[PDB]
Symmetry: C3
Subunit: 142 residues, 3 copies
């Protein structure tokens, strides 16, 4: 079917998520509360939204660039399942030594509806061999 | 058809399971006890090797409970479709509280993300 | 429509992104500068690239595992819109007590062209119910 993104407001403070540029990846999420993210700490910021996205996708809470370089803010967790109908919370980590203030309505993250596959796991005794093989953790160099 | 092939590397390994019916992720279990030091990191073995299809990769993604309760985040996390080595999970501990992972704990979730991998075309103008 | 990944060098310090293995998810990104990511701090590292990827995708700047494990480096931000035509910057956090040196040409992140959907958002009074838990 056609993809969709449906949102239900859980309070008046909720804000409809907002696209950026026309080919933009995400929908900006706004805080439904006044809060803060403590220096070198974390916070759970409610959006007061419940959402629905299609089977074969999930909604990823992803970081905004401005907040990253200006405030050292990153998004923790962030995997919203397509069948999750509870309140959507944004987990922020503050990797700086100053508290980050959040006012209600402030755009604190961006939601991206990522395409995925979910096949049944097939357990095998052997896998195919490749060029990469067991190479990882810097095997291709600096 | 998409696939997710999993090879157990030891009897400590657990076949990943999805936590809910339409869930994005297959939960990954730790094959060891391990300390994740405050403001530090740990590399946790799953004792699994995997294969996913060309046109996808396996992303090691953070679980919400570990993040919210324990300030745990997943570093790195890009498992290439051609990687046949052991899948390892990098955890960062973004708190001043030392934390301990126990054998069998679900410490991350694997998501098989759809991607494209075209050959790069260099241009002087992008549109 | 066939996917593409168009790249424009903004300087001679830019490097065309390359796949680290034949079926790699990502294209490695090189620093166009000598810089550093301070201990417990951050840096924006220019690539001197502008890029374009298709509608229905975005370019994700993602962390390399070697740098993550050896140097506690992680990638912040990282969402490059398919219609973004400015310079592509890599935002790095350093989660260790040791400064991390960046030399020009060092591969400091990887770019993954992730498939997405971008439907028009709609507010509803009631969502469809699901059996969860
Ligand atoms: O950042 C987040 C992450 C998750 N969530 C919600 C939606 C998601 O479908 C649901 C479960 O998230 P995780 O699977 O990542 N957390 P965990 O595995 O610890 O809990 P559970 O056992 O319920 O799956 O929590 C948020 O609201 N914000
Ligand atoms: O979290 C991770 C990340 C990577 N890996 C493995 C699988 C992956 O295909 C391989 C290489 O990952 P990256 O390309 O993201 N890191 P890096 O570029 O430093 O390693 P390499 O030079 O080998 O490509 O390491 C893990 O086991 N866990
Ligand atoms: O890591 C990044 C992230 C973004 N960017 C560029 C490309 C992206 O399309 C553009 C905007 O990214 P964000 O939406 O994450 N930033 P923000 O929401 O703060 O600002 P804007 O008003 O431009 O959307 O900045 C980078 O170069 N590196
Ligand atoms: Mg934006
Ligand atoms: Mg879960
Ligand atoms: Mg690599």
């Amino acid at each position: 079917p056609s993809p969709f993104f449906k949102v239900k407001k859980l309070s008046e403070k909720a804000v409809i998520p907002t696209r950026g540029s026309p080919l933009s990846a995400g929908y900006d999420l706004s805080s439904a509360v006044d809060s803060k993210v403590p220096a070198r700490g974390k916070a759970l910021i409610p959006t007061d939204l419940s959402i629905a996205v299609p089977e074969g996708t999930y909604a990823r809470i992803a970081p905004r660039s401005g907040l990253a370089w200006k405030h050292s803010i990153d998004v923790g967790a962030g995997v919203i399942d397509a069948d999750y109908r509870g309140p959507v919370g944004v987990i922020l980590f503050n990797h700086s030594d100053a508290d980050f203030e959040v006012k209600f309505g402030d755009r604190i993250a961006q939601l991206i509806i990522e395409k995925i596959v979910t096949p049944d796991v097939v357990e095998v005794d052997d896998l195919d061999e490749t060029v990469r093989g067991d190479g990882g953790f810097g095997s291709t160099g600096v």
